[PDB]
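User: We ran a pulldown and think these components assemble together. Before we commit to crystallization trials, I'd like a predicted model of the whole complex to look at. Sequences follow.
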Amino acid sequence: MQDVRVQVLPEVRGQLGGTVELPCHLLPPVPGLYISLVTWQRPDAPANHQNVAAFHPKMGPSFPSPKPGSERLSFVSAKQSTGQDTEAELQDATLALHGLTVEDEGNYTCEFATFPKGSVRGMTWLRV
Amino acid sequence: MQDVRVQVLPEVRGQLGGTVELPCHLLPPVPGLYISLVTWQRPDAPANHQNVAAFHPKMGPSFPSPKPGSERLSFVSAKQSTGQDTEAELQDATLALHGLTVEDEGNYTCEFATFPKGSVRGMTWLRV
Ligand SMILES: [Cl-]
Ligand SMILES: [Cl-]
Ligand SMILES: [Mg+2]
Ligand SMILES: [Mg+2]
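Assistant: Here's a predicted model for the assembly, 256 residues in total across the polymer chains.
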């Protein structure tokens, strides 16, 4: 079973008041690897305020910080299961920020909690 | 819903050739918080070799580094579900190292991947 790694861009440039995407993908495809969770964190934030977005395969997204907050964040492509007919897909963890503010600038870390490989991460600087 | 934090000791002293435990507990009890995964990492290791142990609620433990490796690691108290009669318990992520070697010394990070709160961690220096 191959190791997995988090593919990101090192820097993304956004426009104030606009939307920007932070690509994040778990590579390569590894049959049998289970993605238990994905999170986005601001690693330079106070330690108890690092998590800004999370995604669970069965329960979907959460946004455990008021800023940027649910209203200004979306998982662009991640899918949760909503019934017997639908399966989760967390491999593309790309995050969008909406209504960009100056306080949104900085480092963002995309982390996949996987089994059996454990947790792996990649970091992007959002420049606004 | 209260934030959760990882409770650890800052330093644990082991004896060469012996067993040592690294306590790790997710606090406080939070009704509704789901623990998706726990991992133990060596944060000072090369980046692609940080994960040394993982625990999934349904699939149990994995040890994605040859050292210390499965033979020399155990989750002291974590429980997986093994059927309809049993439920997982990951809140106590305490790790034991066995047959301690000098190469085992250093920082160990215990991380819980939770929903909806995201991923939180605590770090302990194992002194041997
Ligand atoms: Cl590999
Ligand atoms: Cl709180
Ligand atoms: Mg928070
Ligand atoms: Mg490995």
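Residues 28 and 102 of chain B are 34 Å apart (CA to CA). That may be worth checking against your pulldown data before setting up trials.

User: Thanks, that helps.
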